Amino acid sequence: EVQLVESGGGVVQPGRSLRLSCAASGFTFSSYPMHWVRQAPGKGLEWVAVISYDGSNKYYADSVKGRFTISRDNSKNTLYLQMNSLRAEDTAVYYCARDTEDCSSTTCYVDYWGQGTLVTVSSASTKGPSVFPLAPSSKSTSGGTAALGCLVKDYFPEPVTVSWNSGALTSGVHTFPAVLQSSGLYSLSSVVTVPSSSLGTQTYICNVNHKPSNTKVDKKVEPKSC
Amino acid sequence: TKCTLKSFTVEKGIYQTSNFRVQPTESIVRFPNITNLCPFGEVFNATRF
Numbered sequence: 001e002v003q004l005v006e007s008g009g010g011v012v013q014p015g016r017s018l019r020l021s022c023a024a025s026g027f028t029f030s031s032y033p034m035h036w037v038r039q040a041p042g043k044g045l046e047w048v049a050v051i052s053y054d055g056s057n058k059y060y061a062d063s064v065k066g067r068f069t070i071s072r073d074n075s076k077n078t079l080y081l082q083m084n085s086l087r088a089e090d091t092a093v094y095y096c097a098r099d100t101e102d103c104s105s106t107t108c109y110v111d112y113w114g115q116g117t118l119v120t121v122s123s124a125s126t127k128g129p130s131v132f133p134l135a136p137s138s139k140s141t142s143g144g145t146a147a148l149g150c151l152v153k154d155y156f157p158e159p160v161t162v163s164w165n166s167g168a169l170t171s172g173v174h175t176f177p178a179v180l181q182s183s184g185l186y187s188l189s190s191v192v193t194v195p196s197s198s199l200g201t202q203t204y205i206c207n208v209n210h211k212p213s214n215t216k217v218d219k220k221v222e223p224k225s226c
Numbered sequence: 227t228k229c230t231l232k233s234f235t236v237e238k239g240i241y242q243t244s245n246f247r248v249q250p251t252e253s254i255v256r257f258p259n260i261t262n263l264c265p266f267g268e269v270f271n272a273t274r275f
């Protein structure tokens with residue numbers, strides 16, 4: 001019954017050094033080893049480091065040498081990770097985790113995961129998405145169900161929100177993972193199903209809230225002259 | 227000879243005083259050309275003893 005709240009995070013530029021601090025609650029902090037476990041988008045789990053129950057011994061990962069240091073402020077129930085000189089590959093959710101002192105040595109398998117931040121590695125501006133329609137107005141001739149949608153091109157970081165007519169359409173709501181532009185710019189298309197005989201019955205509005213910059217821009221999706 | 231016989235005068239004869247030995251002019255070492263260091267890291271410094 002453990003809750004972990006992680007401070008720090010956000011977009012970071014490569015070559016900068018900062019730190020996270022994870023406050024723990026629901027147990028005795030100064031008698032449990034801590035772990036950092038990377039959860040990379042589309043990769044999975046990657047162990048990072050471990051700090052002893054008293055913080056006596058510190059172990060770091062292989063490809064992390066020269067990058068990170070990890071300390072542990074037992075007073076306010078926090079684990080500190082000072083990361084330095086980040087690279088563009090280091091974007092992930094880095095879950096802090098509490099061990100169980102069960103194995104014969106002072107390290108063992110882990111049980112409790114805390115919801116880490118999303119330190120975002122990029123050397124570029126945070127660009128807000130521009131909302132674009134998707135209604136061919138001549139190619140939706142599928143009769144019963146034709147997919148028409150919305151474009152969310154140029155959004156960074158990835159937190160994003162798509163609702164169709166304020167959520168009026170719920171079946172076939174395809175929200176897709178980012179379709180990354182070759183210049184590393186995020187984009188995705190989110191679509192819904194329409195009977196082409198009822199194209200203009202309900203005016204479609206694609207509402208996106210871009211959490212990083214709070215880009216709150218909406219755009220119509222209507223059968224055009226095209 | 228005087229120091230061997232402990233006298234300042236010696237009498238006609240042959241006396242054996244010391245030992246002759248040729249001396250080493252050089253020091254050589256021959257070891258195998260093994261090159262890899264030894265895995266002491268994963269014996270002394272390991273988690274599970």
Ligand SMILES: *[C@@H]1O[C@H](CO)[C@@H](O[C@@H]2O[C@H](CO)[C@@H](O)[C@H](O)[C@H]2NC(C)=O)[C@H](O)[C@H]1NC(C)=O
Pocket residue numbers: 266267270271
């Ligand atoms: C594992 O054990 C070895 C001893 O076999 C230790 O060697 C350390 O190497 C680093 C780098 O030079 C230095 O901290 C010291 O030379 C050694 N540490 C000491 C004396 O505390 C070391 O504990 C471990 N080896 C490595 C590479 O971490």
